């Protein structure tokens, strides 16, 4: 995505997390924004120093190289449960002879 | 909650949130070069500034950590080999009177201001106005005044500037229970904690002053036979048993005698050839210039420059219609972000200005892996040293005959070979008894070896016991001479250049390592060179996570450097010298002087 997510002015509405210190399982979202701290507190006040909250952002400029630019990705994934086939490929016909 | 958790978990951050100071400086940095406008310089000083801005408080709060436990030595040399150390802890004002006086001696010595004080009706600066005096002169009413005519100008007006910047350095160097303040030049040199790949605490005199025991002896060669060049228009002043005046050097300051291969040239209004300007008649623009900058890369194996290059670069000159600057400069913004910022024009002089400075940001994109806290030089010397490689790397044969420069009418003559060797004599030690003279001034004088009576008596003495270039006019304290200097303006370290010219060779060798060629070594190209193909892909890529003591074993395994690789490609101008010394002037005298 070139000219779709590239702001001149800056592009700080996509964020995304740099600190979790809680691994992953797998198709886990994790929307809470519980504050990260590398301090023994539970965080005095609201935000500041020593206390690194989890949301970060990006900064997408029109002029970076290829690995910085954005891209946009999505994943189709395939399950199979008892229930009857719902979805399904497209079955093409021929002429009625 | 360790300290080894404690220093990725703030590093990560750390580095995240410095990319992106570093892309907002650096787009105030880049787009001020370009278009030079009034309200370009208000919008460049305060978002250059605004990466200091985060970091003059930030770095304190990065250093708040002691880091007592650290166990791996990654992150340990991302945060201590960066302490800015500054005004936090001494003062704030005896700091902004550092920053006074760096006004006075960088803004108002940029450019210089040389007035006529004969008559006032000759308005001439150092360069519009000397230079072509300079440039062809007879008579001695002003050639032998040139030199003591800065001395005699401007010489008198760096007076105060002499004394309270070298008596201040001893209250800076007490900040950090450091021995100087040569240790935070010498920073990134300090590298103890390693086992064995290091230099010793106690092997930097090893170090520092052994190297130079080696191109002495090369330097007496030229130095009986470029000291008796000068019988065309010297009359009178300067004998053959004597030695060189100092108004040789073709600017003011003159770090380098390198300017002296113009005042030997043997037919000046007959040229021979002109194999430089063969580029005019065919009529090649400035971006096959640049096409095949790249494919000198491609040759090697070097992967070519990414699709956003070809238009945000500097490519046609814009004139002063679009007032800009024409400083040559590579530039890496970071964040997969490649261009550069040269002088481009319709000439061929720029080719070799070029593909000295196009190895500069394929050196940036070998260490993209890591970030910003490894992405420069091991030290000060590595960011051009893959730049003088290949500087000389163009003006070869292979590469200027194969494309159609040539004759093929004139037969190959071995007589005719005498002026082409003669250009690169003067290049390789025509700034080495520079080198020498300033590496004793301010290394260990400050912690209490210099009182006020031997200010510059002991300066003096060090032009003609080694380097030899005498003075024609006797002098006093009042002819104070490093202010002058462009580099001592702003205070920049000459170990660079002294590790400059002796760190090509070690891979300069490595080009031809099976029988150094196919016959003589006049002819060195990389044209196809798949042996060399992924050589130097390893070479490059580790920036600064092995430091700049072992950066020379990724293919040879030296420990140190020597000058016996600068042996093989000068063998037609070693024997040159070698059979010269034979009527010239022998030893040398403590005391001649051409007064
Ligand atoms: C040390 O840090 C580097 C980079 O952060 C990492 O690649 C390496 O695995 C670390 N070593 C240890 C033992 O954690
Ligand atoms: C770099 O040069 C190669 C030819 O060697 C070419 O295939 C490639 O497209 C070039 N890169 C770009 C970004 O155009
Ligand atoms: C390039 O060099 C390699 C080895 O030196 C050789 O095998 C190959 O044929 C060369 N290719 C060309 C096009 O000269
Ligand atoms: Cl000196
Ligand atoms: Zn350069």
């Known amino acids: 995505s070139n000219k779709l997510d590239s702001k001149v002015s800056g592009n700080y509405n996509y964020l995304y997390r740099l600190f979790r210190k809680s691994n992953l399982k797998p198709f886990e ?20 120093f020593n206390c690194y909250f989890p949301l970060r952002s990006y900064s997408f400029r029109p002029t970076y190289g290829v690995g910085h630019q954005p891209y946009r990705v999505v994943v189709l994934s395939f399950e199979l449960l008892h229930a009857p086939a719902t979805v399904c490929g497209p079955k093409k016909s021929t002429n009625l002879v | 909650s360790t300290i080894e958790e404690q220093a990725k978990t703030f590093l990560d951050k750390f580095n995240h949130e410095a990319e992106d100071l570093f892309y907002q400086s650096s787009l105030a940095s880049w787009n001020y070069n370009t278009n030079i406008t009034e309200e370009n310089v208000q919008n460049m000083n305060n978002a250059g500034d605004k990466w200091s801005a985060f970091l003059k408080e930030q770095s304190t709060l990065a250093q708040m950590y002691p880091l007592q436990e650290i166990q791996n030595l990654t992150v340990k040399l991302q945060l201590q080999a960066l302490q800015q150390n500054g005004s936090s802890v001494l003062s704030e004002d005896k700091s902004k009177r550092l920053n006074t006086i760096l006004n ?19 308005c001439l600066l150092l360069e519009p106005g000397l ?60 590298v103890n904690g390693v086992d064995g790949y290091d230099y010793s605490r106690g092997q930097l005199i090893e170090d520092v002053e052994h190297t130079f025991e080696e191109i002495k002896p090369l330097y007496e060669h030229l130095h009986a036979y470029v000291r008796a060049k000068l019988m065309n228009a010297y009359p009178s002043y300067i004998s053959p048993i004597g030695c060189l005046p100092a108004h ?21 209004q007959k040229p021979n050839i002109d194999v430089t300007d063969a580029m005019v008649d065919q009529a090649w623009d400035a971006q096959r210039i640049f096409k095949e900058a790249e494919k000198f890369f491609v040759s090697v194996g070097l992967p070519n420059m990414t699709q956003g290059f070809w238009e945000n670069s500097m490519l046609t000159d814009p004139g002063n219609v679009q007032k800009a600057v024409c400083h040559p400069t590579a530039w890496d913004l970071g964040k997969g972000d490649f261009r550069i910022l040269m002088c481009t024009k319709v000439t061929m002089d720029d080719f070799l200005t070029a593909h000295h400075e196009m190895g500069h940001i394929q050196y940036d994109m070998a260490y993209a892996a890591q970030p910003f806290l490894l992405r420069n030089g091991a030290n000060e010397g590595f960011h051009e040293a893959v730049g003088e490689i290949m500087s000389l790397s163009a003006a070869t044969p292979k590469h200027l005959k194969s494309i159609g420069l040539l004759s093929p009418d004139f037969q190959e003559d071995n007589e005719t070979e005498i002026n082409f060797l003669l250009k690169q004599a003067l290049t390789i030690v025509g700034t080495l008894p520079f080198t020498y003279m300033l590496e004793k001034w301010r290394w260990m004088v400050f912690k209490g070896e210099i009182p006020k009576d031997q200010w510059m008596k002991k300066w003096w003495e060090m032009k003609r016991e080694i380097v030899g270039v005498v003075e024609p006019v006797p002098h006093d304290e009042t002819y104070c001479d490093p202010a002058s200097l462009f580099h001592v303006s702003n205070d920049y370290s000459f170990i660079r250049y002294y590790t400059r010219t002796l760190y090509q060779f070690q891979f300069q060798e490595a080009l031809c390592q099976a029988a150094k060629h196919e016959g003589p070594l006049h002819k060195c190209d990389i044209s196809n060179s798949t042996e060399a193909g992924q050589k130097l892909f390893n070479m490059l890529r580790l920036g600064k996570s092995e430091p700049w003591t072992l950066a020379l074993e990724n293919v040879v395994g030296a420990k140190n450097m020597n000058v016996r690789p600068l042996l093989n490609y000068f063998e037609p101008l070693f024997t040159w010298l070698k059979d010269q010394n034979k009527n010239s002037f022998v030893g040398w005298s403590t005391d001649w002087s051409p007064y």
């Not at chain 1, 979202?29 to 500041?48: F, L």
């Not at chain 2, 803004?107 to 006529?116: D, E, F, H």
């Not at chain 2, 008579?139 to 309270?164: C, F, H, I, M, T």
């Open chain 2, 248 to 268: 040789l050097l073709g600017d003011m300051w003159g770090r380098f005698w390198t300017n002296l291969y113009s005042l030997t040239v043997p037919f000046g």
């Open chain 2, 131 to 190: 230079n072509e005096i300079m440039a062809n002169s007879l008579d001695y009413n002003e050639r032998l005044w040139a030199w003591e005519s800065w001395r005699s100008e401007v010489g008198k007006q760096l007076r105060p500037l002499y004394e309270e910047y070298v008596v201040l350095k001893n209250e800076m160097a007490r900040a950090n229970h450091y021995e100087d303040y040569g240790d935070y030049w010498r920073g990134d040199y300090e």
């Open chain 1, 29 to 48: 979202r994790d929307i809470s924004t519980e504050i990260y701290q590398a301090g023994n507190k539970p965080c005095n006040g609201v935000a500041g």
């Open chain 2, 104 to 122: 006075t001696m960088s803004t108002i010595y940029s450019t210089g201001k040389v007035c006529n004080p004969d008559n006032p009706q000759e």
